[PDB]
From a paper:
The β-[name] (EC 3.2.1.26) from the ascomycetous yeast [name] (Ffase) is a robust glycoside hydrolase (GH) that releases fructose units from sucrose and inulin (hydrolytic activity) but also produced 6-kestose, 1-kestose, neokestose (all trisaccharides) and blastose (disaccharide) by transfructosylation of sucrose (transferase activity). Ffase is a butterfly-shaped homodimer of 160 KDa included in the GH family 32 (GH32). As with other β-fructofuranosides of the same family, Ffase performs its enzymatic action through a pair of key negatively-charged amino acids in its active site, namely, Asp-50 acting as a nucleophile and Glu-230 as an acid/base catalyst.
However, only sucrose was observed in crystals grown in the presence of fructosyl-mannitol, most probably due to traces of this disaccharide in the purified product. Moreover, the glucose O4 is linked through two water molecules to Gln-147, Gln-176, and Gln-228. Thus, in addition to Arg-178 at the conserved RPD motif, Gln-176 and Gln-228 are making an intricate polar net for keeping Glu-230 side-chain in a very precise conformation and for stabilizing the binding of sucrose. The complex Ffase-D50A/sucrose showed that the pair Gln-228/Asn-254 is additionally involved in donor substrate recognition by making direct hydrogen bonds with sucrose.
Residue numbers in the entry:
A (entry chain B), B (entry chain A): 24 to 535
Write the structure that this text describes.
């Protein structure tokens, strides 16, 4: 039952991360681009009747021309009964009408088919539905389900057209068997199981798989990347996304190695999905929370945002001094529709305890970004001082300032976040990990000096960090006290002489 | 250079975890049992000259008849020069004198050979040394090194006799190539490279591998388990140990699957090694710290303990409701030579906010264990109350009590620890993760009610937790304020009616 009396929006509703106006949101679904309308479509696991997961569960729907400003629509798909759910799935555009649902009056770029998990008591099946109006309303296929294996742990179909083998491909999870199942189909209705894939960090269950061709930077080559969500049992606690790099022939995915790697090593990036019908590269986003505490965080009358849309590539990067690995790179999608309210620019700054960088903006939108390239100098300092810190400070409210801290330690070659906020309490905060680290090799070397970069964006209750031009991504929510939100940024150190040179510093106040 | 002026031993030196009397300890080495003398041997990476890592670096040495009472000996092996180190390695007993070092005056069970990494500037090699006095003094082999591949990233040899292929086997890490190399030898001097193994979570580097037959519970069969340390780049930050289950023929290790699993999901369990010459089962221990902060924790005039000795088996356990996996099990070695100073024993207690469990012991050793079997009842409580907490409280000093918290949440089916202690500060505490969790399936079901077990031991500055009879292990150090150490244990809940029934509760104060 949503309490419309208490609205936390003013201080903790993100400006450029999608949130439903009210109710509960989890996994993003049916992500696609309408080439005719030039519209991005976001669907999502949606309970409008509470700020927690519940059935009946629907596909919510929003559209955007630029992946930052969203317009929320009426519910797109709903269950047959109150004790049922339209669980996760995906959308394809059936340009050549292989499904037989579309006539000449439906533009080929708008021949929209949803493939989703129908959840009923003791049964999960893969069902389809078609939209004749650009993805706003759907008709369920008469002969659903299209796949039934008599299981209650069988969900999250990601479907794509595979040109090379001239067929539809589904990757779907046999969740508690720890198997990604690869099915093939000529018409999206009649499916054949081609192979099973089992690898990486199993945790409790497999969920929301994905399989897509990702370009290698500065080349004409590409690799197939298999995405996989696990929850619970993440090594960081709760829910997390992992990936595998290799090749696909339409029947089997063959990884290049047997290594485990995570997509994002924050706590709050789960159920990642890619957009269908992108013409250049790979774009996707995730649900920006963690199953451990998502339904308890102090937001109202909604819970959950998505991450920003991110652009995915592969790059050879040093994982140690000697060895390079083909690694998943992600950078945020931030178009010119984002307004810069104010900015601080500094160059070649030798950081010390008497030379802090402090923003002095007139007001605050609660939306900021910081772009920093730094070099570690050859200075011996005591071990408590081998670091610098970016402080994100609230306004002073009732005599107190709340803040979160993003730092780098030169002795550990590791970034860290501390999202610990004194006095803010909510159920299951025992699982709300406060301190997270990311080890990185230098981005570059300036003679013998190690060079690193960091891009960060803060949007009222969520922070996204991208280290070394997207080599590592870390997504984390944070909850300041009632009425408090980000207002100013400081960069500080305790070193008396310079250990860090900030070659370039850009801190901007942004708005929609 | 160690200050003997300040000694923290009284409040934070463990009683039954080995610590050097003074200086720095990291990885355990040369672990073996002398069947003739009936003595367990522990060697360790040792810097006597500071409470941080430094060269010259030695093998320290201690012995025990029972794996809890340790006698520290003279340094066993030292480097040729001050800018060199005797890095990690292992010991075997050359019963049949394959090496030719041992005549009829040396009992077969005492034909002790150390295989270790010799660290010199820009070079790491595998060297051997032999002991004619039961492992107290060593003579380096005159034709060292026994393996040189012209690398400065080539270390941590674990050697064993393989009967099936009638040869010595060495597993060693080509650290920055992410390879465990398997070599073979008739005589411990002349080696042949047989295979390279690469899998699991790579992080920054491969270190301290092991390969051993682990018995399957209730069976005469076993599996080959490959152990692997990575540091830095643990998904929990810093250093961690992982394992692989499969088969070995003397030349190649073949895992049964391609899954990644960690040995211990605490922050402070690294460089795990197994004892040689164990006749019943598999025994091992690790370094009980994390490279991120190990050299900064507030102990003096030593830093670091080992973990307890643990007993390793394989058991088929539910990782989800549907599926069992052959899983590494570990339980602590705690013999009857440990005195029970006092204990609290309770049976069939329905836990509520008016019925807390509280120890009322006359004094404190700072050494306690708690053994609990609990059951989750069918009670609906508000989301903030779906849990119970074990509080480990210091004595009141300067008007405050320091505490650490171990809990279970029935909504998340997860254990958690909070080792956050306010007002205790030390360098690199930004990496000192305070909140850790572990998801488990129930140990058993009583009709429809979920049953779980938990064994924990607190030894002044270290806590070891074993969930569901050793299904999951979690090791963490903790640092209370100056003079404070564990004094009393409480078990509490906020539920007004019973959510948890404690079938069995045993809390003991222990001593040497
Ligand atoms: C680690 O745990 C294992 C159990 O998984 C323990 O192994 C058991 O150890 C006892 C000896 O302590 C063995 O009993 C012996 O059996 C032989 C004949 O089978 C008999 O001749 C001896 O008199 C003795 O009773 C027992 O068989 C063995 N169990 C298994 C399954 O191997 C081991 O002791 C534990 N180690 C420590 C130090 O706690
Ligand atoms: C995501 O990144 C890719 C490049 O890595 C961008 O792709 C380029 O897009 C332009 C048109 O916008 C094309 O003319 C180029 O040929 C593309 N390059 C490659 C190598 O494909 C893509 O535009 C990015 N998308 C977003 C939304 O940022
Ligand atoms: C962060 O800063 C870097 C500059 O250091 C930006 O990268 C440059 O982007 C421009 C386009 O705006 C390119 O022409 C340059 O070649 C890039 N140079 C470098 C140094 O990368 C980057 O776009 C910034 N990131 C943001 C705003 O998110
Ligand atoms: O809304 C269901 C949708 O979410 C996912 C991924 O988060 O599964 C979540 O919800 C399920 C039902 O409560 C849980 O079984 C699952 O553990 C949880 O992650 C998708 O798998 C599913 O389609
Ligand atoms: O003492 C060296 C010994 O420790 C290990 C494992 O912890 O390596 C540690 O020390 C090395 C030298 O400082 C580092 O290169 C390494 O990263 C660190 O883990 C063993 O690998 C080594 O034999
Ligand atoms: C849930 O929300 C839907 C969509 O607005 C509404 O029509 C329905 O009555 C609600 N049902 C329950 C059981 O709350
Ligand atoms: C084509 O489909 C549309 C639905 O969009 C329907 O109204 C029309 O009658 C159909 N007939 C044609 C165009 O063949
Ligand atoms: C894939 O897994 C399913 C479910 O366990 C099984 O029925 C099927 O035979 C497997 N198929 C292949 C080709 O491995
Ligand atoms: C280091 O310790 C050893 C062994 O106790 C000692 O003999 C040596 O002099 C010390 N060296 C330095 C450099 O302090
Ligand atoms: C055996 O070795 C011992 C110890 O090194 C030595 O005292 C003795 O001379 C040796 N015996 C023979 C026959 O060489
Ligand atoms: C094993 O790795 C080593 C070192 O990288 C390499 O030279 C050797 O050829 C490899 N051997 C095999 C059998 O792969
Ligand atoms: C804990 O309790 C169980 C069941 O009573 C017992 O068998 C076990 O030995 C105990 N564990 C320890 C480490 O004392
Ligand atoms: Zn605090």
């Amino acid at each position: 039952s949503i309490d419309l009396s208490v609205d936390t929006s003013e201080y903790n509703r993100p400006l450029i991360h999608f949130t439903p106006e009210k109710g509960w949101m989890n996994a993003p679904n049916g992500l696609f681009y309408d080439k005719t309308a030039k519209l991005w479509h976001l669907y999502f696991q949606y309970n409008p009747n509470a700020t927690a997961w519940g059935q009946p569960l629907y596909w919510g729907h929003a559209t955007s021309n630029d992946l930052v400003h969203w317009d929320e629509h009426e519910i797109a798909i709903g269950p047959e009964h109150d004790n049922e759910g339209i669980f996760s799935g995906s959308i394809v555009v059936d340009h050549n009408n292989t499904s037989g649902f579309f006539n000449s009056s439906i533009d080929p770029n708008q021949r929209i088919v949803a493939i989703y998990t129908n959840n009923i008591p003791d049964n999960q099946t893969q069902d389809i539905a078609f939209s004749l109006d650009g993805g706003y309303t759907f008709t369920k296929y008469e002969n659903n389900p299209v796949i039934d294996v008599s299981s209650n742990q069988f969900r999250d179909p990601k479907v794509f057209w595979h040109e090379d083998s001239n067929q539809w491909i589904m990757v779907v999870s046999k969740s508690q068997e720890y198997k990604i199942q690869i099915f093939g189909s000529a018409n999206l209705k009649n499916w054949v199981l081609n192979s099973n894939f089992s690898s990486g960090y199993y945790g409790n269950q497999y969920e929301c798989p994905g399989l897509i061709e990702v370009p290698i930077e500065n080349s004409d080559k590409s690799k197939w990347v298999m995405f996989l969500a696990i929850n619970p049992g993440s090594p960081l606690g709760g829910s997390i996304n992992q990936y595998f790099v290799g090749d696909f022939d339409g029947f089997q995915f063959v990884p290049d190695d047997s290594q485990t790697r995570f997509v994002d090593i924050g706590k709050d990036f789960y159920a990642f999905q890619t957009f269908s019908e992108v013409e250049h590269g790979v774009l996707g986003l995730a649900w920006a929370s963690n199953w451990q505490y998502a339904d308890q965080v102090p937001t109202n009358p909604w819970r959950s945002s998505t991450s920003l849309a991110r652009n995915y590539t592969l790059r050879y990067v040093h994982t140690n001094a000697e060895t390079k690995q083909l690694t998943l790179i992600q950078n945020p999608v931030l178009p010119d529709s984002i307004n810069v309210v104010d900015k601080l620019k500094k160059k070649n700054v030798k950081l010390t305890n008497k030379k802090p960088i402090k923003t002095n903006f007139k007001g605050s939108t609660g939306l900021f970004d910081f772009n920093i390239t730094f070099k570690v100098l050859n200075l011996n300092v005591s071990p408590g001082k081998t670091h610098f810190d970016i402080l994100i400070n609230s306004q002073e409210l009732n005599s107190s300032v709340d803040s979160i801290k993003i730092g780098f330690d030169s002795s550990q070659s590791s970034f860290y976040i501390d999202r610990h906020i004194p006095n803010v309490e909510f159920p299951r905060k025992q699982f709300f990990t406060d301190k997270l680290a990311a080890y990185l090799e230098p981005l570059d070397y300036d003679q013998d000096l190690r060079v690193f970069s960091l891009y960060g964006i803060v949007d009222k209750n969520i922070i996204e960090l991208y280290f070394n031009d997207g080599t590592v991504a870390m997504t984390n929510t944070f909850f300041m006290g009632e009425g408090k939100y980000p207002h100013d940024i400081q960069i500080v150190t305790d070193t008396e002489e310079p250990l860090f040179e900030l070659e370039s510093v850009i801190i901007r106040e942004l708005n929609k």
